[PDB]
Design brief:
- The structure is cut from a larger assembly and holds 5 copies of chain A, 1 copy of chain C (27 residues), 2 copies of chain D, 1 copy of chain H (83 residues) and 1 copy of chain J (115 residues).
- By secondary structure, chain D is an alpha/beta fold.
- Chain D has one domain (1-202).
- Chain D has 8 helices and 5 strands.
- Chain D has a 5-stranded mixed β-sheet with strand order 2-3-1-4-5, sandwiched between helices.
- The longest helix of chain H has 18 residues, at 25-42.
- In chain J, 12% of the residues lie in helices and 23% in strands.
- Chain J is built from 1 helix and 5 strands, in the order H-E-E-E-E-E.
- Chain J starts with 15 loop residues before the first helix and ends in a 7-residue tail after the last strand.
- Classes of the chains: A mainly beta (49), C little secondary structure (27), D alpha/beta (202), H mainly alpha (83), J alpha+beta (115).
- The D-G interface holds D 41-42, 82, 85-88, 141, 171, 173, 175-180, 182, 185-186, 189 and G 61-68, 70-74, 83-87, 90, 93.
- Strand 1 (19-21) of chain C pairs antiparallel with strand 2 (72-74) of chain E, so a sheet runs across the interface.
- The structure holds guanosine-5'-triphosphate, magnesium ion (3 copies) and zinc ion.
- Zinc ion binds next to loops of chain J.
- Chain D binds 2 RNA strands through residues 4-9, 11, 59, 61-62, 64-67, 72, 74-75, 78, 81, 84-87.
- Chain D: It comes from Saccharomyces cerevisiae (strain ATCC 204508 / S288c).
- Chain D: Residues 113-116 are annotated as: G3.
- Chain D: Belongs to the TRAFAC class translation factor GTPase superfamily. Classic translation factor GTPase family. EF-G/EF-2 subfamily.
- Chain D: It is found in: Nucleus.
RNA sequence: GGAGGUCAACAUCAAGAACUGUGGGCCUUUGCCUAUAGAACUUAUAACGAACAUGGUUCUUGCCUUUUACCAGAAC
RNA sequence: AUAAAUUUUUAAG
C-alpha cells in the first residue's frame, strides 16, 4: 500500500486514503494530497526528517 | 612541622585548619608551594574532626544545651559538604 | 511500572527519564 | 552447580539402625511397604521427611549448628539447586529406611516425597502409582481445600490406602490463639469435613 | 521523529552545560531558566529553547513495527520550579498552511490586478495590505525598491547551493534569498511570551541586582552600547548564581567584606571586590552608625536620654558576621518602660511590659541573595540568637537591631520599643536610605559595574 | 489464555495477603465468543480484540503461525 | 531487576549490563501477525517468572516464589485481654 | 481565541480538541455550548480573516463526527436574520 | 531479629543499622517526590 | 597556595586603615616604588633601523623595555608615554612617543623608520 | 584449683557438599577398594561481618580542550 | 483510571 521516497531531507510515505482501511484525523506533520478537479483528499503523505 | 620543614613559612594555618597565604606570592613561590591532595585532603579531614570535638567541648563548657548538641553534630554530619571542602581533593566523597 | 517504555537508563540522555502515561489517546 | 548431592562412599551418613540389617528385610515381601507423601503447598511434607530422616541417621553433614537447633528448617529431600532457591519442591524424592513400629518390630519403608504445587500434580500421579499407601498432609489453618479433595479422590480412585496428617499445629495456638475448646471444635470441623469425602471409610 | 527530538534535547542541555562550565558548575540550582531565556534587553543570554516539550516514548520493541502512536511522554527538560517556556515550532506556521494561503492569496492578487488593469486604476496598496505578508513569494516583494534589477537576476538558487564550494564559512540559510522570497518567518511575539512565561519583569528582576542600583522602575534603563560582556553578565545575575541554597560548596567570607561565597565563581570575586574597595564596607557601617548618633543627639529632649555614646568598636566588628556588639548605647534620664520585642512596623505595644535604663543599637549589614532576601526574618533571627546567647555582650538585655540589605537596598529593625522611637526611626531611615554619601557611593559604583544609564 | 499474568496480579494487588492456584482437571472447554469464519472481524492491532470476535482472531493467527 | 534492565515502581534504576540490544534479525518469528495480544505482559511478570515471559535472560536468579500467607493475629489494644481469646476477625465456626 | 491569533489555521488545534473531546463528556458539552456561544453571540466581532480560521476549525470537528453533526442545526439562512 | 532470640553476642556499635529497615519497605504515599528519590538512591547502594 | 586565592590570612589585629596610613608613610623610603620609571614587555609596530650597528628590528619584535610617564600632557589633559628599547646587537636605547592626536607613533634618539 | 581479662603468641576459617586419624586388601610411597573412631567455628533466600569502604589493570560508556579528580556497568 | 524524577567540584597547563 505504501509509496516511499525522500527529497532534500524530507522522507515521505504516501498512503492513498483508499487502502488505509480507516481515515483518522492526524497531526500537522502529515500532508493531505488534494486532487486537481474533484477537490477531494485522496492520500496522506507522512513526513519525517 | 611539615609545612615549615618544606621551607614555606608564609603559609599560615589557623586553628580551624584553613591554610592561607600571609603574603602575595611571587611566581616561584606558587611553584614551590603547591601542596598536593595528600596534605590538603588530610587537612580537610582533621578540620572535620576538630569541628565535632569542638561541639562536644562547648557542650562540656555548659555553653550550649543537651538537645542542641545532638542537633549540632547532626547538622555537621549532614552539612560537611558546606562546612569542610573535602569534596575538592577527592571528588569520590560526593557519594557519601 | 517499567513496561518497556522509557530509556535503557537516563545517563547520557540529559533528561530526567521521567515517563508518564498519556491521558490523551486511550479509547 | 546443578544439584547438591554427596558423592563419596565414606561421607554417606551412618544410619544408626545398621543398613546391612535393613537390606535383609528385602527378602521378606510382606515386610517392606511403600508410602508416598502428598499434600498441598507448604503442608510440611518435605520438612516432615526431614524429621523422619534426622531421627534415623546419627550424624548428618548437612546440619549447620543453625538448622540443628534450627530457626531454618533443614530440608533434606529437597536436593535441587532450583528447588532450594525457588523455595519449593519440584522433582519428587524419596528415601528408604527401617523403623520400629510401636510394638518394636522394625519394618522397611520407602517414602516417596511428592511436590505440593498444583502444577506439579503430574509428579503426584507418580507417587500414587508407586506408593502402597499415601499420607495426605493437611494444614490445620488452611483446612481442606479443593486440591485436598482431589488428592483423596485420586487416592481412593487408585485403590491406595490413606492416612491423614494434620500438620502445623503451632500455627494454631502460637498465631491464631484459640481458646482450648475452640481448637478442639476446629479439629471436629476438619476431621468431620474429611470423612464427608471418604465414602467407604470414616 | 524521535532521534531529532532527542538530539535537540542533548544539544541544548549541552550548550547550557557549556555556559555552566563557563564559570564553574553543572549545578541546577544556580542556573534557573530565567538566567538563560530572558531576552538581551533584560540582560539574559536570550537563547531560544526548543527542547522542553515532552518526548513520545512509546514501546521500543513495537514501534519498530506498527507506529503505535504516542502512548507515553518522557520528560524533555527539567528545572527546579517548572514554570513553562514557549517553543519555536509553535511560532512558525506549518508549510501546508503557507502554501494554501499562498494559492488563495495569489489568486486574489491576480483578480485585484485585473481590476486595476480593466478599470485602469492603480493598486490602493491598502486593499492589498490584508494579505501583505501572506504567500510564499510574500506579496511585499512586488514592491521592493530594486525589483527592476532583480528581474535580471536568474539562477540565484543554484548559486546559493554552490556557495558551499567556493568559500569556507557556511551560510545557514542556503534555501532562500530574502530579496526574492521576502522574509518567511517572524519571532518577536515569542520574545514577549518568554518574559511573561517567567512571571514578568517584576519576578525576573528579583533574580538580578536591579534593586541594588537604586533605580525604581525598569523602563528608563539603557544598558550601555549587541553583546553583553561576561563580567557584566555575572554581576547582573549574581544573587542567583551565588545563592545560599547551593547543594555543595564551601562558604568563604570575602576578605574585608561580609559577603559569603559558595564555592568558587571566577568573575564574581573580581567584580565584587572592585565594588567594595577602600574598605567601603567599614565606611558604610560607621556612616550609618554616625548619622543615627546625630539623630539621637537632637532628640535627647523628648526621650529622656542622659548620653548617646557610640562605643569604641573593635576594628573588625563591621564585617564580622558571627557575633556583634553594641554600636550606640543609651541611658535613661528618668527611667524607661519598654515593651516586648517587635518588628519596626508592628503597631500595638504595651510599654509597661518591662522597665530598664540602658538601651543599645546595632547596625548589621548583610549582602543578600535570591534565596533569602527577606530581612526582617533575618533580623529577628539574629536578635533572638544573640540576646538569648550568653556570649554577645550588651550593657542591658534590651536593645534594637537594625538590618540592611545592601544588595536589595532594603532595611528593617527588630528592637525593644519604648514610646517615641518608631516615629523617629521610620522617617529617619526613610531618609538615610536615600541620604548617606557611602550608600550613594555604592549605588554609583554598581552602576559603573553593570554599565547602566538612566535615560529620560 | 487470560491467565498469562493472573497470579502475580492478585498476589501484588492485595499487598502480599492472599494466594492463587490455577489447575486443570475436569478438562472443561468453552466456546470462544467469536464466529470462527468472518471477513469483517475487527483486528485491533496491538490491542486485545473485542469479544464480538475473539475466534476469528485466534484462528487467523494460529493459521499464520502454522501456515 | 538489574540484569533484565527493569524497575519495580519503587525500586532502583541501574545500567543495562548488556548495552547492546540494537542487533535485530529481521525474521518471521516474533512478527505481529503471528502474535496474540492478551494481557499486557507487565514488567512485574518479567521480574516474577524471569525465564518464562522474558526472552533471552542472562545472569538472572530464581525469585523464591511463595510463602505460607501468615494468619498471625495479636492484640496491642488492651493489656487485660487474655492471652488466648477469640478475635472478632476470625470466622464463627 | 488563541487559535484566532495564529494568522492561519493549524491541524494543531483540531487534533487537540479531538483528543480532548473523547476523554470526558463534559468536554462534549463544552464544545457544543461554545459552538452555540460563538455562532450566536460572538461572530459579529470577527473580521473576514479570522472567519477563515473558525470555518476550517469547526470543519475538521464536524466532518469526523466528533462535534456531532446535528449540532449544525443552529444555522438558519434568511435575508431577515443572517449575518 | 535481635528480639526473638533473647541471647546473642555483642556487635560493634556501627554495625547496627537502624535506618535500613525504613528504606527496604515501600515508600508509602504522602511523601513528596524528594524523599521517594532518596529511597531509590539508598536501595541502589544496598543492592550494589 | 592556589593561583586563584580567595582569602589571605591577616594578623589578628591589623587595623586596615591604620596599615594604609603607616604603609603610606613607608611608601616614600623605598627605592623601587619611587623609581619614577617603569618596565614593560612590548612590541615594535613600525619596525626600525638602528643608528649604531644599523641592525634591523624587522617588523614586530618582543622586547623587555621601559615605559616612562612623560611630563607633557597631550592637549589640556591626555596622557602621553615614552618607551625605550635596547638593541640586540649593541647596547643602545631607542625611544618612542605616542601621539594621541595622530594615532601613529613618532620616535627619536637612536633609531630611524623604514619606508 | 575455680572465676574472669576491651591480654598476648601460634594454629584454622569457602570446599567432590567438601574434615582428620586408624585397621585390612591390590598396584607399586602415591593411588584404588574395604573396615573403624572422632568431627570445634562457618555456610542453603548459601557464609566468617544478620554489617559495608577504597584501590589497581582491562574493556564499555558519561562529562568533554588536555592530565589528575571524575560519571556507572562488567571481568579479573 | 497516573502514581516512573539525570545532574551538582578543585588544582595544573
Ligand atoms: N508454623 C509452622 N510452619 C511450618 C511447619 N512446617 C513447615 N512450616 C512452614 O511451611 C513451609 C513449608 O514447609 P516445607 O515442608 O519446607 O514445604 P513443603 O512441605 O516441602 O511444601 P512443598 O514444597 O510444596 O512440598 C516452610 O517454609 C515452613 O517454614 C510447622 O509445623 N508449623
Ligand atoms: Mg516439599
Ligand atoms: Mg601538555
Ligand atoms: Mg606552559
Ligand atoms: Zn644596534
Amino acid at each position: 500500500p505504501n509509496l516511499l521516497f525522500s527529497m532534500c531531507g524530507f522522507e515521505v510515505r504516501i498512503l492513498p486514503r483508499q487502502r488505509m482501511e480507516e481515515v483518522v484525523s492526524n497531526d500537522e506533520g502529515v500532508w493531505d494530497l488534494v486532487d486537481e478537479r474533484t477537490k477531494q483528499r485522496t492520500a496522506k503523505a507522512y513526513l519525517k526528517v | 612541622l611539615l609545612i615549615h620543614r618544606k621551607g614555606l613559612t608564609y603559609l599560615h594555618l589557623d586553628y580551624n585548619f584553613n591554610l592561607k597565604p600571609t603574603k602575595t606570592l611571587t611566581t616561584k613561590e606558587r611553584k614551590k608551594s603547591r601542596l598536593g591532595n595528600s596534605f590538603h585532603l588530610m587537612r580537610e579531614l582533621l578540620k572535620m574532626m576538630k569541628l565535632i570535638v569542638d561541639t562536644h567541648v562547648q557542650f562540656r563548657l555548659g555553653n550550649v544545651d543537651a538537645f542542641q548538641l545532638a542537633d549540632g553534630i547532626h547538622y555537621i554530619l549532614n552539612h560537611i559538604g558546606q562546612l569542610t571542602g573535602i569534596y575538592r581533593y577527592k571528588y569520590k566523597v560526593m557519594h557519601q | 511500572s517499567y513496561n518497556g517504555i522509557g530509556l535503557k537508563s537516563a545517563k547520557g540522555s540529559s533528561t530526567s527519564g521521567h515517563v508518564q502515561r498519556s491521558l490523551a489517546s486511550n479509547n | 552447580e546443578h544439584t547438591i548431592f554427596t558423592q563419596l562412599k565414606k561421607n554417606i551418613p551412618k544410619t544408626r539402625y545398621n543398613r546391612d540389617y535393613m537390606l535383609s528385610m528385602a527378602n521378606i515381601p510382606e515386610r517392606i511397604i511403600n508410602v508416598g507423601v502428598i499434600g498441598p503447598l507448604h503442608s510440611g511434607k518435605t520438612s516432615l521427611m526431614d524429621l523422619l530422616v534426622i531421627d534415623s541417621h546419627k550424624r548428618i553433614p548437612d546440619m549447620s549448628k543453625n538448622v540443628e537447633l534450627g530457626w531454618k528448617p533443614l530440608r533434606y529431600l529437597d536436593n535441587l539447586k532450583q528447588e532450594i532457591d525457588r523455595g519449593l519442591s519440584i522433582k519428587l524424592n524419596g528415601s528408604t529406611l527401617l523403623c520400629t513400629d510401636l510394638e518394636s518390630k522394625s519394618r522397611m519403608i520407602n517414602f516417596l516425597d511428592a511436590p505440593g504445587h498444583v502444577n506439579f500434580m503430574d509428579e503426584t500421579a507418580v507417587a500414587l502409582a508407586a506408593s502402597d499407601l499415601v499420607l495426605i498432609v493437611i494444614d490445620v489453618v488452611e483446612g481442606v481445600t479443593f486440591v485436598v479433595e482431589q488428592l483423596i479422590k485420586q487416592s481412593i480412585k487408585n485403590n491406595v490406602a490413606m492416612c491423614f496428617v494434620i500438620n502445623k499445629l503451632d500455627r494454631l495456638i502460637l498465631d491464631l490463639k484459640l481458646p482450648p475448646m475452640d481448637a478442639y471444635l476446629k479439629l471436629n470441623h476438619i476431621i468431620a469435613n474429611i470423612n464427608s469425602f471418604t465414602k467407604g471409610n470414616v | 521523529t524521535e532521534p531529532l527530538l532527542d538530539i535537540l534535547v542533548k544539544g541544548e542541555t549541552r550548550i547550557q552545560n557549556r555556559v555552566k562550565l563557563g564559570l564553574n558548575s553543572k549545578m541546577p540550582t544556580r542556573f534557573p531558566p530565567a538566567v538563560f531565556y530572558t531576552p538581551k534587553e533584560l540582560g539574559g543570554l536570550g537563547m531560544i529553547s526548543a527542547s522542553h516539550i515532552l518526548i513520545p516514548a512509546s514501546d521500543l520493541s513495537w514501534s519498530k513495527q506498527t507506529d503505535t502512536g504516542i502512548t507515553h511522554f518522557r520528560a524533555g527538560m527539567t528545572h527546579e520550579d517548572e514554570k513553562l517556556i514557549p517553543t519555536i515550532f509553535r511560532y512558525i506556521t506549518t508549510w501546508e498552511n503557507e502554501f494554501l494561503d499562498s494559492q488563495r492569496v495569489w489568486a486574489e492578487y491576480a483578480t485585484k490586478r485585473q481590476e486595476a488593469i480593466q478599470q485602469n486604476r492603480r493598486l490602493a496598496f491598502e486593499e492589498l495590505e490584508g494579505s501583505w505578508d501572506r504567500g510564499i513569494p510574500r506579496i511585499s516583494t512586488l514592491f521592493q525598491r530594486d525589483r527592476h534589477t532583480l528581474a535580471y537576476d536568474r539562477g540565484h538558487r543554484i548559486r546559493r547551493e554552490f556557495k558551499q564550494y567556493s568559500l569556507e564559512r557556511n551560510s545557514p540559510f542556503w534555501w532562500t534569498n530574502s530579496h526574492h522570497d521576502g522574509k518567511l518567518w517572524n519571532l518577536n511575539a515569542y520574545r514577549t511570551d518568554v518574559i511573561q512565561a517567567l512571571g514578568g519583569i517584576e519576578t525576573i528582576l528579583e533574580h538580578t541586582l536591579f534593586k541594588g542600583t537604586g533605580f525604581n522602575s525598569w523602563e528608563g534603563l539603557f544598558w550601555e552600547k549587541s553583546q553583553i560582556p561576561n563580567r557584566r553578565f555575572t554581576l547582573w545575575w549574581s544573587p542567583t548564581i551565588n545563592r545560599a541554597n547551593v547543594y555543595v560548596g564551601f562558604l568563604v567570607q570575602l576578605d574585608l567584606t561580609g559577603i559569603f561565597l559558595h564555592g568558587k565563581i571566577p568573575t564574581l570575586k573580581i567584580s565584587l571586590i572592585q565594588i567594595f574597595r577602600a574598605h567601603l564596607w567599614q565606611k558604610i557601617h560607621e556612616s550609618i552608625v554616625f548619622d543615627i548618633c546625630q539623630i539621637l543627639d537632637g532628640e535627647l529632649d523628648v526621650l529622656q536620654i542622659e548620653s548617646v555614646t557610640k562605643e569604641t568598636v573593635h576594628p573588625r566588628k563591621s564585617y564580622k558576621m558571627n557575633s556583634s556588639a553594641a554600636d550606640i548605647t543609651m541611658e535613661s534620664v528618668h527611667e524607661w518602660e519598654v515593651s516586648k520585642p517587635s518588628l519596626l512596623h508592628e503597631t500595638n505595644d504595651s510599654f509597661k511590659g518591662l522597665i530598664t535604663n540602658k538601651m543599645w543599637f546595632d547596625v548589621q549589614l548583610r549582602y543578600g541573595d535570591y534565596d533569602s532576601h527577606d530581612i526582617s526574618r533575618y533580623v529577628r533571627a539574629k536578635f533572638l540568637d544573640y540576646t538569648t546567647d550568653n556570649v554577645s555582650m550588651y550593657p542591658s538585655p534590651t536593645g534594637v537591631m537594625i538590618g540592611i540589605d545592601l544588595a536589595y537596598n532594603m532595611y528593617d529593625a527588630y528592637g525593644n520599643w519604648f514610646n517615641g522611637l518608631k516615629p523617629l526611626i521610620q522617617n529617619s531611615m526613610r531618609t538615610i536610605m536615600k541620604a548617606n554619601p557611602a550608600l550613594y557611593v555604592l549605588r554609583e559604583r554598581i552602576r559603573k559595574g553593570l554599565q547602566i544609564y538612566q535615560s529620560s | 489464555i487470560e491467565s498469562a499474568g493472573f497470579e502475580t496480579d492478585l498476589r501484588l494487588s492485595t499487598n502480599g495477603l492472599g494466594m492463587c492456584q490455577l489447575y486443570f482437571w475436569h478438562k472443561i472447554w468453552r466456546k470462544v465468543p467469536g464466529d470462527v469464519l468472518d471477513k469483517d472481524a475487527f483486528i485491533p492491532k496491538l490491542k486485545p480484540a473485542p469479544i464480538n470476535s475473539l475466534s476469528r482472531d485466534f484462528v487467523m493467527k494460529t493459521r499464520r503461525r502454522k501456515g | 531487576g538489574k540484569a533484565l534492565n527493569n524497575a519495580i515502581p519503587g525500586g532502583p534504576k541501574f545500567e543495562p549490563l548488556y548495552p547492546r540490544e540494537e542487533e535485530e534479525d529481521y525474521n518471521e518469528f516474533n512478527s505481529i501477525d503471528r502474535v496474540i495480544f492478551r494481557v499486557p505482559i507487565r514488567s512485574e511478570y518479567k521480574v516474577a517468572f524471569p525465564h518464562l515471559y522474558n526472552s533471552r535472560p542472562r545472569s538472572v536468579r530464581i525469585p523464591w516464589y511463595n510463602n505460607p500467607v501468615s494468619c498471625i493475629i495479636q492484640n496491642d489494644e488492651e493489656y487485660d485481654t487474655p492471652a488466648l481469646f477469640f478475635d472478632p476477625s476470625l470466622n464463627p465456626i | 481565541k488563541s487559535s484566532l491569533q495564529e494568522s492561519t489555521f493549524s491541524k494543531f488545534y483540531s487534533i487537540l480538541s479531538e483528543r480532548m473531546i473523547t476523554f470526558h463528556r463534559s468536554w462534549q458539552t463544552a464544545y457544543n455550548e461554545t459552538f452555540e456561544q460563538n455562532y450566536t453571540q460572538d461572530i459579529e466581532d470577527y473580521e473576514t480573516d479570522q472567519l477563515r480560521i473558525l470555518g476550517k476549525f469547526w470543519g475538521h470537528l464536524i466532518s469526523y463526527e466528533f462535534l456531532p453533526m446535528d449540532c449544525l442545526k443552529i444555522i438558519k439562512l434568511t435575508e431577515e436574520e443572517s449575518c | 531479629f535481635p528480639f526473638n532470640r533473647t541471647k546473642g553476642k555483642m556487635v560493634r556499635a556501627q554495625d547496627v543499622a537502624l535506618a535500613k529497615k525504613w528504606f527496604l519497605q515501600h515508600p508509602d504515599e504522602e511523601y513528596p517526590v524528594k524523599v521517594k528519590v532518596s529511597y531509590q538512591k539508598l536501595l541502589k547502594n544496598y543492592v550494589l | 597556595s592556589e593561583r586563584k586565592a580567595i582569602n589571605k590570612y591577616y594578623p589578628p589585629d591589623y587595623n586596615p586603615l591604620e596599615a594604609e596610613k603607616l604603609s603610606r608613610k613607608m611608601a616614600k623610603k623605598l627605592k623601587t616604588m619611587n623609581k619614577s620609571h617603569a618596565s614593560i614587555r612590548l612590541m615594535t609596530p613600525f619596525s626600525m633601523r638602528c643608528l649604531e650597528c644599523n641592525e634591523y628590528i624587522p617588523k614586530s619584535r618582543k622586547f623587555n623595555g621601559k615605559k616612562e610617564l612623560l611630563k607633557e600632557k597631550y592637549l589640556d589633559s591626555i596622557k602621553i608615554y615614552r618607551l625605550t628599547i635596547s638593541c640586540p646587537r649593541c647596547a643602545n636605547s631607542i625611544a618612542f612617543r605616542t601621539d594621541p592626536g595622530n594615532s601613529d607613533y613618532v620616535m627619536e634618539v637612536g633609531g630611524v623608520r623604514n619606508y
